[PDB]
Every structure is written in C-alpha cells, then in structure tokens.
C-alpha cells in the first residue's frame, strides 16, 4: 500500500526537500575548499564572504517575502528553484576551471586575475543563497501549511520529518563530497557537484508542479518603494504578537556550541583525534532527532506554548554543564574538562531542536497569510544578524582561552533568548 | 608512463647555432609545462625556460644566451635553439615536465651534454 | 631573483646516523596553503629524481626515510636513518615565481 503512499503531495514535499538539501550541504562544501585551499592565510576575505551573505539577507530579507507574497505559489516557487540551482552550476564550473589551474593562479599571474575570481564566486554564491532563502520561505512557511489542512498535527509531524531530513543531510552529505575529493579530485567533485544540481533541478521541478496539482488550494492566494517596503515589513514585525519568540529564535545563533563551528579544532587542540570527532558528531545528530521526536511528543501533550518553556529548560539545563567544564582543570581558560563540555553540547541539541521546532510552528499558526512572506523575511534577515555576529567574535578570537569566553558568551545569549520567549510565554497565557 | 629523451648534436663551434629536441612518449605536450634546463661543469642547476600547453612560452632574462623554445604537437616533439653560441654553453641539458596537478619537475630526460669549442 | 642558500655544502655522515639539509630563500616561497619548495636527488651520471614536493610531500617510490619540512623562507630536508645508497647531490628549488632557481646543491658523503 505504499504505492498511495509515495504518489501523495507530502511525501513529494519531502523528496523535492530531501535533495535540495543535500545540494545546498554539497555547495557550502564545496565553496569551504575554495577559500579553505586558493584563500589560506588571508583574513580579511573571509569576513568578507560571511559579511557579503549575511548581509545581503539582511538588506533584502523584506524584500523578497514581499515578492513571495506579491505573486503566484508556483510562479515563485518554480523560479527561486531555477535561479539557485543555476547559480550553483555556473559557479562550480567555474570552481572546476579555478581548481585546474590553482598554482598558476598563484604564482604565475597579476593578483587581480585571483581577486576577480573571488568576487565573481562570491557574487554568484550570494545570489543563490538569496534564491534559497526565498525557497525556504515559500516552501516551509507557505506551501507545507497549506498542504497541512486545519490539523495541527499534521504540521508538527512535517515539520519534525523536515528537521530529521535536514539533521541527516548535515553529516551525510559532507561526508561523501569529501569521499568524493579525496577518491578523485576537487575538479571531479566540482564537476559531480553541478551535474548533481543539473539534474536535481528538473527533478525538482516536475516534483514541484506535481505538488500543485495536487493541492489545489495552492492556486488561491489571500489577496523609493522598495524603502517602503522594508520600513513596513520591520514595523509590521515587531508588532506581531509572536516577536519576543522569534526574537529568542535569533538570539539563539549567536552561539558558538556546536559541531559546524570552532569546536572541532578546539577539540583537535584538547588532544581528540578524528574519529572520536565523527562520533561526537554522530551522537549530535542522534539527540537532534530526538529533539524532533520531544516536540511531537511535548506538543500532543503540554501544547506548544508549554513545549517551547520546557526545550529552553532543557537546553539550559545542558549548557550548565559547558559553563561548569569552563571552570574546571585542564581547562586552557586532562580529559574532564572537553567531557562535560561535549557532554552538554551533545545534550543540549534536544531541546535545541525542540524549541525552533515549536518557534517555527507559532509562526506559522499565527501570521495571517497575506503577511506570510515578509514577515519570514524579516525573521531570516533576524537570524543571520545574529549569525553574522558570531561570524565576527569568532574571527577577532581564535585562541584557546578566547573559547572559554566565547562559551561564556554563548551560554549568556541563550538565556537571554529565553528569558524573551517566558515573557512572551508568561503574557500568552 | 611518460618518457622524455633529449637529442642533438653532441659538439658545436662558436657563433654558431646548435638546436636540441626533446621527444615525449606517454603524454601530449598539450597539457602541461614543458621545460629546459642545464647544468654547467661543476655542480650548478640553470633554469632556461618553458614553452606552455599553449604554445606560450618564456625565456629566463637572466640568461647570456639568446634562446627560442618551439614545438611540434603532431609528432609531440619540442625543441630548443641556442643563437651564437659561445664556450661558456658547454653544458648538460635536460628537458622535464611540470604538471598543473604537480608543480614540480615530476619528470626529466637523461640529458644530453653539448661541448663548444673552436 | 629569489636566492636560494643551502646548507652545509658537503655533509659526511656514518651509516645509520641522520642527515639534516637546510635551505634559505631571499623571499617567501609560501602563497596561501602552499610553500613551493622542492627537493630532488642527483647520483653522478644520472638526472636528477624528485624527493621531496611542496615542501612536505614525499613522492611515488621515494623510501620513508626522506621527509621535509619547513616555510616562508626557511626549509629542512631530513634523512633517518641514512643508508649507503643515499651518497647523492641533493638541491632545493622554488617554484612561487619566475624565474625558478636551484640551490647551490648538496653533496652527501657517506662518513668513512
């Protein structure tokens, strides 16, 4: 009976997520090894990148939900598909071409040759991380709550699937891009990488318009300038009654406890090999999906108000044991130390998850639909401000007593996020 | 499996011009860098230059020789020519290639040894 | 041009013992990840064989004993243990600009 199953539009909108996901994972993989291999020992060009995209989101985060909401599901949805996967194309054929002639770049040409080509990578990276975000708004803040009906759990069970997706793709696909780097060449994997997107976009693409016609309530929408726009899209943000959640949601990144940040080489430093890395990881991914499966559980239970007090709880109560290992011997502010911060991280990921799993459904229960859009926008140009603060504190402070204060730091962000999300809790109820 | 190996006359005379070939199995001349290079009586390693998958080539300036660096991709043969050659040429010379994925001499000839005299 | 400086200019060791040859550049050799540093072999008669390339990588066939290390301006090419057929001209070149050049050489003899 699986063959209903597999012709029904939810799992359509998992499978078109599933590989999406794993293209955008193999594309942030591949743009590392550039400027990991042809940008070495250059500071100012990573911040540089971080600052071009977090701040390109954040100037045009407004502006884009209102060109979601401004026009037709399918219309939009079809071209920020398009848009990104050819940026992506394009881009890797030209990392392919700048990977062939690395050392020729850098010994054998004027250094505008090298600098032109960072800015065009740059450039086109930055376009399709504004086409991703525009899909991330108006697939999982628009289409999935129409393909959910009325039911709430519905919407929680595809919203926590959409998370364990994404929580695999996290550790699988770096792991075969860089199977793929090694086993052949970063040129193979440049090349195996723009294939992959040429062919996942048709894919997507047909899995897209198969969604729309079996939806048919997706064909009914509700309803300087574009300075307008982005002053109307920030004041109508912070008068939602759902700000002070979101608002602890961005908090949330500013965050330096966890495994895709500065953790890994601290953990090299603290005399961990490689493989006790990949487990670690592994049992982050492990708590992540358990995280997904206490919102279920929580939300059923509790409701979602309650959910989200309870995974702050638990998340603090986690990261305790970070602050305590801050302050413990063999700390650089022996084992004990890098075991009870570990400890915590992998702990905290529980109700990490749990409480954006529950951010995410309060806003989408409680926008209107005709502000469905901008309103998210203005939510990812709140997330990568914070995001982009890390992006810096990291960067100005990159020796080991420097990562007991950035833990500390950390862990005082995190609280602040939910003293926000209580008090908008304790005024909801 | 590729194989470089030099050939020329083995003896020049002064103000004369002495041309060597460098014949390549195992690998077109259309991909890599392809490169000469002598050692004098004595111990010392010169640079002489390359001619490029391309055809472009370059000339080390601060030789006292006039040199041309020319190929033939048909028979995927290369070659050096020195103009006016004076005693202080008398040399071993090698041709090797540098690979784009490399970036060394990851392969030479045998050489073969010119001695200028009159 | 980039000056290449070896040293010493003739090494003698006894079998078994290490061999430690250093070279100095006028100017960096390192751009980005990669230092370009290159080591080969000259036995008399012969051409000479690549060893060691981008300063630490040991190339195909070439026995464990040899490694490299070093950057910017400064590198070491290490031999443990040395053994007889090791007596050879050793030479550093650079890569990071034209035109490359070649250290002075460095002629291993096996100490009596």
């Known amino acids: 009976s699986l063959a209903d199953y597999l012709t029904s539009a939810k799992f359509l909108l998992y499978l078109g997520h599933s590989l999406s996901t794993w293209g955008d994972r193999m594309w942030h993989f591949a743009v590392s090894v550039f400027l990991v291999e042809l940008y070495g020992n250059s500071l100012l060009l990573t911040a540089v990148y971080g600052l071009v995209v977090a701040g390109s989101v954040l100037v045009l985060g407004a502006i884009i939900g209102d060109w979601v909401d401004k026009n037709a599901r399918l219309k939009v949805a079809q071209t920020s598909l398009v848009v990104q996967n050819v940026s992506v194309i394009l881009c890797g054929i030209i990392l392919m071409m700048v990977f062939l002639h690395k050392h020729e770049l850098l010994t054998m040409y004027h250094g505008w040759v090298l600098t032109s080509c960072y800015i065009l990578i740059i450039t086109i990276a930055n376009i399709a991380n504004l086409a991703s975000t525009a899909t991330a708004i108006t697939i999982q803040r628009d289409w999935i709550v129409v393909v959910a009906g009325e039911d709430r759990s519905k919407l929680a069970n595809m919203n926590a699937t959409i998370r364990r997706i994404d929580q695999l793709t996290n550790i699988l696909a770096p792991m075969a891009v860089g199977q793929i780097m090694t086993f052949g060449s970063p040129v193979i994997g440049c090349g195996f990488i723009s294939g992959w997107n040429l062919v996942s976009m048709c894919v997507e693409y047909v899995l897209l318009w198969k969604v729309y016609q079996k939806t048919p309530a997706l064909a009914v929408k509700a309803g300087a300038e574009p300075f307008r726009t982005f002053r109307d899209g920030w004041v109508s943000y912070y008068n939602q009654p759902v700000f002070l959640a979101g608002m602890g949601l961005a908090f949330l990144y500013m965050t330096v406890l966890g495994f895709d940040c500065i953790t890994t080489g601290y953990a090299y430093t603290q005399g961990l090999s490689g493989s006790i890395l990949s487990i670690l990881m592994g049992a982050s991914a492990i708590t992540g999906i358990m995280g997904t499966v206490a919102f279920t559980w929580l939300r059923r239970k509790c409701g979602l108000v309650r959910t989200g007090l309870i995974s702050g709880l638990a998340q603090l109560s986690c990261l305790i044991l970070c602050v305590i290992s801050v302050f413990m011997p063999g700390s650089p502010l022996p084992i004990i130390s890098v075991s009870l911060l570990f400890a915590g991280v992998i702990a905290a990921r529980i109700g990490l998850w749990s409480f954006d799993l529950t951010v995410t459904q309060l806003l989408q229960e409680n926008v209107i639909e005709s502000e469905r859009g901008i309103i998210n926008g203005v939510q990812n140009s709140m997330n990568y401000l914070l995001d982009l603060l890390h992006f810096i504190m990291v960067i100005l402070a990159p020796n080991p007593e420097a990562f007991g204060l950035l833990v500390l730091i950390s862990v005082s962000f995190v609280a602040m996020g939910h003293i926000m999300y209580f008090r908008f809790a304790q005024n909801t109820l | 499996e590729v194989q470089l190996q030099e050939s020329g006359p083995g003896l020049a005379k002064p103000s004369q011009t002495l041309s060597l070939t460098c014949s390549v199995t195992?690998?077109?001349?259309?991909?890599?860098?392809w490169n000469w290079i002598r050692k004098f009586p004595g111990n010392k390693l010169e640079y002489m230059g390359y001619?490029?998958?391309?055809?472009?080539?370059y000339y080390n300036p601060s030789l006292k020789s006039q040199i041309s660096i020319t190929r033939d991709t048909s028979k995927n043969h290369y070659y050096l020519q020195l103009n006016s050659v004076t005693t202080e040429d008398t040399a071993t010379y090698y041709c090797?290639?540098?690979?784009?994925?490399?970036?060394?001499?990851?392969?030479w000839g045998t050489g073969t040894t010119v001695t200028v005299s009159s | 041009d980039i000056v290449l400086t070896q040293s010493p200019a003739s090494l003698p060791v006894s079998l078994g013992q290490r061999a430690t040859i250093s070279c100095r550049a006028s100017?960096?050799?390192?751009?980005?990840?990669?230092?370009?540093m290159h080591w080969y072999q000259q036995k008399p008669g012969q051409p000479p064989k690549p060893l060691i390339y981008?300063?630490?990588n040991l190339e195909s066939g070439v026995p464990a004993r040899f490694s490299g290390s070093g950057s910017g301006t400064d590198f070491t090419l290490n031999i443990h243990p040395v053994e007889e057929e090791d007596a050879a001209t050793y030479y550093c070149?650079?890569?990071?600009?034209?035109?490359?050049?070649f250290g002075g050489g460095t002629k291993l003899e096996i100490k009596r």
């Open positions: 070149q650079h890569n990071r600009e034209l035109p490359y050049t």
């Open positions: 001619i490029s998958y391309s055809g472009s080539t």
């Open positions: 090797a290639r540098q690979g784009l994925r490399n970036w060394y001499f990851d392969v």
């Open positions: 100017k960096s050799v390192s751009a980005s990840a990669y230092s370009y």
């Open positions: 981008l300063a630490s």
């Open positions: 195992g690998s077109s001349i259309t991909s890599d860098y």
